[PDB]
């Protein structure tokens, strides 16, 4: 959720995460999850950046500019990933940055 | 004179020679070689894309999945999904399904 400089409040959706099983005992134990994230970035322009991802093409979007509408394809960066209780704990506290 | 005696007995290879430090003399750190480093964040950074709705809700209010469906319902022009960049080590049709 964010507030524009114009004052408008807004709710944003970047994608989805699918949590696996999570019988986390030790603080290093892993939850597997899948992250499905929108993007306009073409992965082929920098394929070494996306070793772990499987990038899909899922739609097309009409985008405003100054005085012209552009047609861009919509990608979905998909990957399996993991985290732990200790890493989640420290992510929850990232405001101290 | 126990310390002085043994200090006379000890080899003069046991020493701490001061080598003066000039940062004009010294070299740059060696960075390794190998395949390129991949992205490893838990979520996309600069490559992220948002679907959003205008919403007076505050910085953590509303049912997440209800909010999510509201954001999805702003975008049409979805497509039949196709793989445009494989996860070389993965069964990519699982990601598609």
């Amino acid at each position: 959720k964010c507030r524009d400089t114009s004052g408008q409040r807004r709710t944003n959706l970047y994608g989805f995460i699918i949590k696996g099983r999570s019988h986390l005992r030790n603080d290093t134990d892993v939850v597997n999850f899948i992250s499905l994230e929108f993007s306009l970035t073409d992965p082929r322009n920098e394929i070494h950046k996306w070793e772990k991802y499987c990038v899909l093409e899922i739609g097309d979007m009409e985008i405003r500019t100054s005085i012209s509408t552009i047609m861009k394809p919509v990608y979905l960066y998909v990957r399996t990933n993991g985290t732990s209780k200790i890493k989640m704990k420290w992510g929850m506290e990232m405001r101290r940055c | 004179g126990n310390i002085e005696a043994k200090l006379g007995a000890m080899s003069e290879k046991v020493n701490a020679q001061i080598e003066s430090f000039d940062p004009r003399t010294i070299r740059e750190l060696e960075l390794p070689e190998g395949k390129f480093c991949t992205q490893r964040s838990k979520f996309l950074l600069m490559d992220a894309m948002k679907l959003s709705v205008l919403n007076p809700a505050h910085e953590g209010e509303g049912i997440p999945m209800k909010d999510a469906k509201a954001c999805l319902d702003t975008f049409w022009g979805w497509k039949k999904a196709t793989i445009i960049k494989k996860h070389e080590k993965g069964v990519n049709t699982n990601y598609l399904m």
């Binding site: 009409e62 985008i63 405003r64 500019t65 100054s66 552009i70 | 600069m46 702003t74």
Partner: peptide, 10 residues
């Protein structure tokens, strides 16, 4: 630039 790839106007 021309548009925002993170906050596209659609």
């Amino acid at each position: 630039p021309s548009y925002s790839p993170t906050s596209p106007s659609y």
